Each structure stands twice: as C-alpha cells, then as structure tokens.
C-alpha cells in the first residue's frame, strides 16, 4: 500500500505514514509538485531534472552524489511537501488539520481577519518529522541533506503573505477581508533557483561523539559570509552533463531540443557542447483567423503553421 | 473550464446562455457573482445605458464557449458606452464609476492578442 514504494523505509517512518495516513496523499503530491517545478526551473539546461523520481521513494536513504543539483532537488522536494500539505489542510475536509485558527493580532485598519489562513506551520512540521524519521547517520551527505531540506521547508514559512478579498458595494475595496496565505508555488521555485545559483560549497571535517565519528560541514571559502539556514550547501563537484556519464551521472545532451536564437545554455553551441545540431521541420494544424460575430459566437479558420526544431548531436 | 448554464436572473436573456467560474473577480460560485451584479439592478432599470446589462454580465458571468476557449471580454467600446451613460448618475451622489468596471483594462477592436465582444 502507501509508503511501500520507499525502498529503505525504516519503522519510525512507517509509523508516521500510518499515524498521518490522512495527509499522506498530500505529502506525495508535495514531492510531485517540487520535482515538476525542478523540471521547469531547469527546462533548458544540460541537466533538465528528468532524472529524478517523483515518488515517496525520495524519502528514506539519501545516497545521490552531493552536487549542487541534488541540493536543489531535495530542497524543492521538502518545500513541495510543506506546500501541498498546508494547501490540502486549507481545503478543509480533514480531521487532523485545517485552516490556521489561532488568534491573529488586531487587523490593519482597512480590513478584518477572515477567510481561511493556511497553516504553514503544520505543513513544515510534517515535512520535518517525516524526513527526520529516517535512520540517522553521522554522514557528511546526511549533514548536507539536513541543511538543504530545512532551507526548502523554511521558505514555505518565509513566503506567507497577506491576501484580501474586496466585498461591499460593487466590490469596492473599502470592506476588506484578509488572511495569511501561500504564494503560487512558482515563487518558491524561483526563490530556491536563486539560492541554487549562490549555493555555498563546503568541505568535510569529522569529530567524535559518544556514538563514534560524526562528519560536519564547513564553508570552503572562509572570506565570504557563511551559509545560513535558508541557503543551499553542497560539497561535491557537479559532473560534465555533456556526454552520457558512464558512471550513471546522467545522459548526454544528444537529441535534446535546441534554440538557435540563444547564445546561452539553451542555445545550440552550449547545450550541445560544441557538437553539431540536427534540424527537422514540422507542421501543426491550428485555428488562426478567428472572427467574433455579434452575437455571440466565434468562427475559426484552419491553417497550418510550420516551425523548425534543432536537436543536438 | 466547464461551461455551466447561467442562473443569475439579471444575466438571463442577454444573448449567450453559458458562463464559467471563477470569473476575473475570483467569484467561486455563480451565486456569489450574482449577489454582486444584482447590486447594479437599479442602474439597469433606469436605462441610462442600453449596453449596461450586457456589459455587467460580460464581466461577472463571462461568456463560455464549447467551441472556442481563449479569452473573450467585452470590447473597451462597450464599457465606454456604458460609462458615458451611467457614470453621470452615480456622480450626482458623489460616486465614481466602480474600479471593477474600469474600461481601460479592456481590449479594443483589432487587438491581435485577443478578441472582444461588441456589435457591428
Ligand atoms: C530531459 O533530458 C532527457 C535526456 O537528456 C530527455 O529525454 C530523452 O529525449 C530523447 C529525445 O526525445 C530520447 O532519445 C530519449 O529516449 C529521452 N529519454 C531518456 C534519455 O530517458 C528529455 O526529453 C528532456 N526533457 C526536457 C528538456 O523537457
Ligand atoms: C530562444 O531564445 C530567444 C532569445 O533568448 C528567446 O527570446 C526565445 O523565446 C527562445 N525560444 C524559446 C522557445 O524559448
Ligand atoms: C438560451 O436559452 C433560451 C431559452 O430560454 C433561448 O431562447 C436562447 O436562444 C438561448 N441562447 C442561445 C445562444 O442558444
Ligand atoms: Cl541535499
């Protein structure tokens, strides 16, 4: 049944799945939402994030290489969970969570509190307990993943903002009702993509505690401001995504779709890493000269638009 | 997405029968839309503009087509005819034309990006 797919599920996790069975569908959608955004944020890059599996199997043992990209994958996966869990509870209908009901301070002047403020705290705590039910390793990879998972979570809290409805005469905004709310998930993906661009690189150090040797991370370049709880960290170099990685890094860029106009990464010199690019032409049928007619319908004409698609060699 | 039949009394009989929700105003159900546009009934009744009623519903119960699913607002000209006819009335009591019916947000005939509803 559910959480079965997870391939290194430990009993602490399974207990959580069963205690929180009523919101586990939204945990699952959370992950799917994050990886979907990942694929959007890297839609034109050498690594386009279609490697990654969107199932709950990402929970459980973290064994992928400690690259910047993984730092982002896990971050946006945590945030997706915190997001979708908060959003689902806000849709009502669930016994263990709902709208955030706790007394909010006296309102701003134009308005009154109302609606359904999203319980972002609940979602973040669910994100964290499920990730933390994982078996705990003194791993360097586990220290990084603890850090980035929290950075993804925390910005779900950070992105809560005011949203108001205007009612009163003819919708006039002088009778206003506000609630705490989440952005579209795109705000989250854009935010973390920036944090991806500024991710701090670390080095591995190790000190002993009572259960043996632990490994900790330390900023590699001390002269800069160290990473914070909201920053992304990593400590392995990312591979060359040009060629199919024989050590299952990833595939090549071969036959990835290409943009002749652009001289950035999504362009055909960079995306194809100096190899050529093929080209084929294609035709699609579509509606084009649609007239409106008083009243009230629309008439469309069929015509065939042609475009060319360059794919890397 | 789904085209639902128009239920709000004011907007029954305007020349198209099917709307969708939510509208541009985030009205979730067609009744919630109704309870706002029905506040305009006195203005429809006075007949300050013969376009007022069609214009109002073209925003609150926007036309919904099975055939064609791109945006289809009223043309700016429709709103402008309605504002020309009815804003004077509201001004006599000190009221401006409501922000939601601001005409300048609406397209004009000949816009490539989108079509618009008006007679000619
Ligand atoms: C993301 O990248 C992968 C490969 O880098 C693309 O998947 C491959 O697409 C090519 C051409 O369509 C096929 O030959 C392969 O069979 C595809 N699947 C693989 C390698 O598993 C994928 O289309 C890219 N998606 C984007 C850019 O949206
Ligand atoms: C290709 O690159 C150009 C220039 O950056 C951009 O304007 C255009 O939208 C791109 N095409 C696509 C499909 O993104
Ligand atoms: C809407 O329904 C009425 C019947 O009440 C009909 O007379 C009218 O023509 C219909 N409109 C369209 C566009 O079919
Ligand atoms: Cl990570």
Q: How far is residue B20 from each of residues A150, A183, B56, measured CA to CA in Å?
A: 41, 24, 15
For this PDB entry, the determination method is X-ray
- Partners of A201 in the beta sheet? A234
What b/e sequence results for A167-187 when a residue is b if at least 16 CB atoms lie within 10 Å of its CB, and e otherwise? Answer: beebbeeeebbbbbbbbebee
Q: How far is residue A73 from each of residues A86, A150, A307, B78, B101, measured CA to CA in Å?
A: 20, 13, 33, 50, 44
Residue for token digits 């000209």?
B77
Radius of gyration for chain B, computed over Cα atoms and rounded to the nearest angstrom: 14
Please choose, from the candidates A296, A293, A258, A297, the residue with its C-alpha nearest in 3D space to the C-alpha of residue A274: A258
Q: How far is residue A154 from each of residues A45, B4, B80, measured CA to CA in Å?
A: 27, 41, 48
Helix, strand counts (H, E) of chain B: 4, 2
- Partners of A162 in the beta sheet? A180
Q: Is A172 within 8 Å of chain B by CB? A: yes
Mutate to test the pocket of ligand 2, among A259, A260, A266 (most ligand atoms within 8 A of CB): A259
Question: B1-120: which CATH topology?
Answer: 1.10.2000
User: Which positions ≥6 away from B75 have C-beta within 8 Å?
Assistant: B106, B107, B108, B109, B116, B117, B118
Write B25-30 long-range contacts (CB < 8 A, 24+). B25/A171, B25/B59, B25/B60, B25/B100, B26/A165, B27/B60, B30/B4, B30/B6, B30/B61
Please choose, from the candidates A210, A231, A95, the residue with its C-alpha nearest in 3D space to the C-alpha of residue A155: A231
User: Which positions ≥6 away from A51 have C-beta within 8 Å?
Assistant: A250
Report DSSP state, residue A14: H
Instruction: Tokens for A256, please give them.
Output: 């990835």
B2: cis peptide before it, omega within 30°? Answer: no
Inter-chain residue contact B72 with A292, CB threshold 8 Å? yes
What b/e sequence results for A195-231 when a residue is b if at least 16 CB atoms lie within 10 Å of its CB, and e otherwise? Answer: bbeebbebebeeeeeeeeebbebeeeeeeeeebeebb
Sign of the dihedral through C-alpha A9, A15, A21, A23: negative
d(CA B90, CA A256): 60
**What is the B15 CA–ligand 3 centroid distance (Å)?**
7
User: What angle separates helix B52-60 from helix B30-37, to the nearest 10 degrees?
Assistant: 150
Instruction: Tokens for A211, please give them.
Output: 């259960």
């Amino acid at each position: 049944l559910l959480c079965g797919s997870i391939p290194g599920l430990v009993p602490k996790q399974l207990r959580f799945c069963r205690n929180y069975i009523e919101i586990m569908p939204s945990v699952a959608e959370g992950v799917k939402l994050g990886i979907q955004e990942c694929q959007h944020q890297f839609r034109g890059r050498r690594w386009n994030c279609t490697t990654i599996d969107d199932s709950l199997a990402i929970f459980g043992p973290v064994l992928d290489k400690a690259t910047r990209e993984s730092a982002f994958v896990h971050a946006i996966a945590s945030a997706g969970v915190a997001f979708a869990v908060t959003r689902s509870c806000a849709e009502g209908t669930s016994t263990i969570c709902g709208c955030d009901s706790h007394h909010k301070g006296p309102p701003g002047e134009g308005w009154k509190w109302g609606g359904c403020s999203e319980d972002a705290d609940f979602g973040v705590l669910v994100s964290r307990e499920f990730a933390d039910a994982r078996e705990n390793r003194p791993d360097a990879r586990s220290a990084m993943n603890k850090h980035n998972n929290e950075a993804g979570r925390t910005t779900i809290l950070d992105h809560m903002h005011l949203k108001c409805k205007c009612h009163g005469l003819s919708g006039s905004c002088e009778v206003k009702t506000c609630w705490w709310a989440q952005p579209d998930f795109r705000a989250i993906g854009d935010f973390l993509k920036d944090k991806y661009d500024s991710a701090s690189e670390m080095v591995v150090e190790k000190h002993r505690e009572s259960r043996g040797w632990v490994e900790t991370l330390r900023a590699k370049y001390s002269l800069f401001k160290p990473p914070t709880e909201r920053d992304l960290v990593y400590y392995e170099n990312s591979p060359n995504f040009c060629e199919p990685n024989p050590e299952t890094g990833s595939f090549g860029t071969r036959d990835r779709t290409c943009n002749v106009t652009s001289h950035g990464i999504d362009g055909c010199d960079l995306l194809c890493c100096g190899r050529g690019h093929n080209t084929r032409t294609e035709k699609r049928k579509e509606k084009c000269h649609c007239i409106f007619h008083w009243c009230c319908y629309v008439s469309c004409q069929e015509c065939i638009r042609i475009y060319d698609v360059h794919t890397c060699k | 997405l789904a085209c639902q039949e128009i239920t709000v009394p004011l907007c029954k009989g305007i020349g198209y029968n099917y709307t969708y929700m939510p509208n541009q105003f985030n009205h979730d159900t067609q009744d919630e839309a109704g309870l706002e546009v029905h506040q305009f009934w006195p203005l429809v009744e006075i007949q300050c503009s013969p376009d007022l009623k069609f214009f109002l519903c073209s925003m609150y119960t926007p036309i919904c087509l099975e055939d064609y699913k791109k945006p289809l607002p009223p043309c700016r000209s429709v709103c402008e005819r309605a504002k020309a006819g009815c804003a004077p009335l509201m001004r006599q009591y000190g009221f401006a034309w409501p922000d939601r019916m601001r005409c300048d947000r609406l397209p004009e005939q000949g816009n490539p990006d989108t079509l618009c509803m008006d007679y000619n």
